[PDB]
Amino acid sequence: QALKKYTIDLTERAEQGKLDPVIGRDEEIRRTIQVLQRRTKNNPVLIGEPGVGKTAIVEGLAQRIINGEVPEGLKGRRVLALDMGALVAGAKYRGEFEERLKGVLNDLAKQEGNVILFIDALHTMVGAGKADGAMDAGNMLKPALARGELHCVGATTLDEYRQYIEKDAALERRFQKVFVAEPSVEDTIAILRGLKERYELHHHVQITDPAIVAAATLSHRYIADRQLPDKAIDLIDEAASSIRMQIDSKLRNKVTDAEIAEVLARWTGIPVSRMMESEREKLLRMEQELHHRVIGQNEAVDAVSNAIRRSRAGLADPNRPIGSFLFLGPTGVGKTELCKALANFMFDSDEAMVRIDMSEFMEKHSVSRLVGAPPGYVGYEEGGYLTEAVRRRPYSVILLDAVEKAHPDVFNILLQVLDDGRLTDGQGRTVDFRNTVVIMTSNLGSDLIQERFGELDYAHMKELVLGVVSHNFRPEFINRIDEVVVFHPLGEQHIASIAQIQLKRLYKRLEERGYEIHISDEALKLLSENGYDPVYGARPLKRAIQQQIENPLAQQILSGELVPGKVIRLEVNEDRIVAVQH
């Protein structure tokens, strides 16, 4: 009949057992039954945020009907998953949709109060038969709803509920709101323990139950895209397919929690991966790798090494971010170099990061540049720069440079940030900063540091510059810092080592060009004499390397003088540096 054409019996499928076991949801199914045994407006609607198991509530109710675990008034009923695409499709003629829907309604009256109706996507039922001068499904179902003589069950997302049903109050009051919350962690672990049998029967592999509880735990903590139980189910399924292809292509036979971590790190790259000996010996050689690019300035290397080790070691403060820092020193001591060193350690690249230089924000209102603009105003549909740049890749490094340049009340934003890792952009959603490192640099007591780094300890220098910082900032803000570090002007040996590093990357780029070039150490001594001052550090070394290398060497390369394969000693002139061809 017409019920055969447009409806699908879920209860016959659960009678075949071809539906999923549904475990839990007891108050939700009980209130759904309480609404379904009424006199007027029998119709519960499963308002719940997208992917918390709303279809599975009705499927589990169908299974409880088949098992006979319902009250006596529901024993022997039929749940029919109504189809909207079956009804819209065949009707470009006038009245043909209304013909079908009225025939369905007369069949449902004919079934004598035995058919439970399930309508997935109730928001699809709203704009259903919207042809020019045509009733939708609302204008035809709406009689039989509030006489109680239809046993509809809605299932809709809450954002679809606002736009598509709360806009139409008449059909909005015909139903009964059933909030279906995202489950907490422990109950989701229980549900996943229920569903282990299905995936074991599907992929013929086994699952570690610690991997299950780790998938639920890490999914609730780190992934902010989807919602429970959906994200954890997808973790388990994708791990199962990965193990199946590891076996079948070319080891193991189960699904460990390390496989869960590999799935999560493949999905984003938050380094939940366990400390393998390459990674763990890398992490124990933290300061050694930081002094592969940054000579000197030991104490901040120590502090950030400590913070990243406490992050990776499973001792993360789960609400504050990784490290809430503050760098302080005179101009040109490689503060940005240390930040690029962290980026290169973490991501194998300097500019795989976000640097936002706060000298651009010397006015107040650029707060709205990084957090966005409210509803109504100009740049609403774009988001703040900082929030979006986190919202793509949350495991990153957020760098603020020249923090003395901006207005003091930009730093209520970072009060939020360093309190909880939370930030709310102009559209009004939270952005998790629990995988970020915040570094702020200034040159506050640079006169005081250049004056008194000699003949003083590190500690009371930090004390005195902290007093200067309290003269600068707010007591709220500097409480949020994990650790304030102090930089110092470098000796000439540090600048000679930096010149060695610049010669290393120069010879790297000239082997890329294809030239075997060496240097006299006297030329290194002359370059150390040239770009040196205690007041400015190595940016004079930058310009000295720039001029006295990049001008004559590249001038003689383009002069046809430098032949590849020749030994090229960068020896000295009387006042300059000369290359040879030997």
Ligand X SMILES: Nc1ncnc2c1ncn2[C@@H]1O[C@H](COP(=O)(O)OP(=O)(O)OP(O)(O)=S)[C@@H](O)[C@H]1O
Ligand Y SMILES: Nc1ncnc2c1ncn2[C@@H]1O[C@H](COP(=O)(O)OP(=O)(O)O)[C@@H](O)[C@H]1O
In the complex, the residues that contact ligand Y under the rule CB under 6 A are 294-297, 331-337, 441, 498, 537-539, 542
CA 368, CA 362: separation in Å to the nearest integer?
13
Type of residue found at 285: R
Residue (122 or 440) nearer to ligand Y, CB = 440
Dist. CA 141–CA 144, nearest whole Å: 6
Site string for its own copies, 229-268 (x = CB under 8 A): -------------------------------------x--
Segment 266-273 long-range contacts (CB within 8 Å, at least 24 positions apart): 267/223, 268/222, 268/223, 268/393, 268/394, 268/395, 269/393, 269/395, 270/222, 270/394, 270/395, 270/435, 271/312, 271/395, 272/218, 272/222
What is the Cα–Cα distance from 107 to 115, expressed in whole angstroms?
10
Q: Is 337 annotated as a binding residue?
A: yes
Q: Which does 233 bind (CB under 5 to 8 A by kind): its own copies, ligand Y, ligand X, none?
A: ligand X
Work out whether 50 is an interface residue with ligand X (CB under 6 A).
Answer: yes
- Comparing CB distances to its own copies, the nearer of 1 and 331 is 331
On whether the CB atoms of residues 418 and 481 are closer than 8 A, the answer is yes
Residue 498 touches which member of ligand Y, ligand X, its own copies, none, C-beta under 5-8 Å by kind: ligand Y
Q: Using the rule CB under 6 A, is 157 a contact of ligand X?
A: yes
CA 214 from chain center: how many Å? 18
The two beta strands, 78-82 and 7-9, are: antiparallel
Which one of ligand Y, its own copies, ligand X, none is in contact with 475 (Cβ closer than 5 to 8 A by kind)?
its own copies
- Strand 354-357 and strand 396-401: the pairing is parallel
Number of residues in contact with its own copies, rule: CB under 8 A? 12
Here the tokens at position 282 are: 């890398």
Q: Does 229 bind ligand X (CB under 6 A)?
A: yes
Task: Evaluate the CA torsion angle 384, 386, 387, 393 in order and state its sign.
Answer: positive
β-bridge partners, 401: 357
- DSSP-based three-state secondary structure for 562: coil
Select from 331, 349, 573, 581 the one that contacts its own copies (CB under 8 A).
Answer: 331
Q: Taking CB within 5 to 8 Å according to partner kind, which of ligand Y, its own copies, ligand X, none is near residue 550?
A: none
Per DSSP, the three-state class of 477 is helix
| Nearer to ligand Y (CB atom), residue 37 or residue 331 | 331
Q: With CB cut-offs between 5 and 8 Å by kind, which of ligand Y, its own copies, ligand X, none does residue 54 bind?
A: ligand X
Distance of CA 218 to the CA centre of its chain: 13
Q: Write out the binding residues for its own copies, residues 170-189 only, by CB under 8 A.
A: 179
For residues 455 to 494, the per-residue mask of contacts with ligand X, x marking binding by CB under 6 A and - elsewhere, is: ---------------------x--x---------------
Minimum distance of ligand Y from residue 293's CB (angstroms): 6
Q: Is 332 labelled as part of a ligand binding site?
A: yes
Q: Is the link from the previous residue into 229 a cis peptide, with omega within 30 of 0?
A: yes
Closest separation between CB of residue 537 and ligand Y, Å? 5
- Which residue bears the tokens 């299974």? 63
Q: Decide which of ligand X, its own copies, ligand Y, none touches 200; Cβ closer than 5 to 8 Å per partner kind.
A: none
DSSP state of 181: P
Sign, Cα dihedral of 149, 155, 161, 163: negative
**Residues in the chain, total:** 582
User: Counting contacts by CB under 6 A, is residue 29 touching ligand X?
Assistant: no
* 55 binds ligand X, rule: CB under 6 A: yes
> In this complex, which beta carbon is closest to its own copies, that of residue 279 or of residue 476?
476
- x/- track of binding to ligand X for residues 310-349 (CB under 6 A): -------------------x-xxxxxxx------------
In the complex, minimum distance from the CB of residue 328 to ligand Y, in angstroms, rounded to a whole number? 10
What 8-state DSSP symbol labels residue 153? -
Q: Which does 24 bind (CB under 5 to 8 A by kind): ligand Y, ligand X, its own copies, none?
A: ligand X
Radius of gyration of the chain (CA): 34
Q: Contact at 8 Å (CB) between 72 and 107?
A: no
467 sits in which H/E element? helix 458-472
Give the whole-angstrom CA distance, residue 436 versus residue 317: 12
**Which sign, positive or negative, has the C-alpha torsion 458, 464, 465, 469?**
positive
Q: Note whether 475 binds its own copies by CB under 8 A.
A: yes
CB 129 within 8 A of CB 20: no
By C-beta, is 25 or 340 nearer to its own copies? 25
- For the bound state, the minimum distance from the C-beta of residue 334 to its own copies, rounded and expressed in Å, comes to 13
**Smallest gap, in angstroms, from Cβ of residue 264 to its own copies?**
13
C-beta of 229 vs 445, nearer to ligand X: 229
Stretch that binds ligand X, among 29-37, 209-217, 290-298, 436-444 (CB under 6 A): 290-298
**Could you give the angle at the alpha carbon of 393 between the alpha carbons of 389 and 397, nearest 5°?**
75
- Tokens for 210, please give them: 């610690």
Residue 230 binding: pick among ligand Y, ligand X, its own copies, none (C-beta 5-8 Å cut-off by kind): ligand X
Q: How far is the CB of 276 from its own copies (least distance, A)?
A: 15
Which C-beta is closer to ligand Y: that of 295 or that of 431? 295
- 23 assigned binding-site residue: yes
Measured N-to-C along each axis, helices 257-267 and 230-249 cross at an angle, to the nearest 10 degrees, of 100
| Residue 90, both tokens | 């065949």
Supply the angle between the helices 209-221 and 185-194 in degrees, to the nearest 10. 140
Nearer to its own copies, 254 or 266 (CB): 266
> Is 333 known to sit in a ligand binding site?
yes
Site residues, its own copies (CB under 8 A): 27, 31, 179, 266, 269, 331-332, 336, 419, 475-476, 479
Which residue ranges are tagged as binding site for ADP? Answer: 23, 51-52, 54-55, 295, 332-333, 335-337, 539, 542
Site residues, ligand X (CB under 6 A): 20, 22-25, 50-56, 157, 191, 194-195, 229-230, 233, 294-297, 329, 331-337, 419, 476, 479
Which residue ranges are tagged as binding site? Answer: 23, 51-52, 54-55, 295, 332-333, 335-337, 539, 542
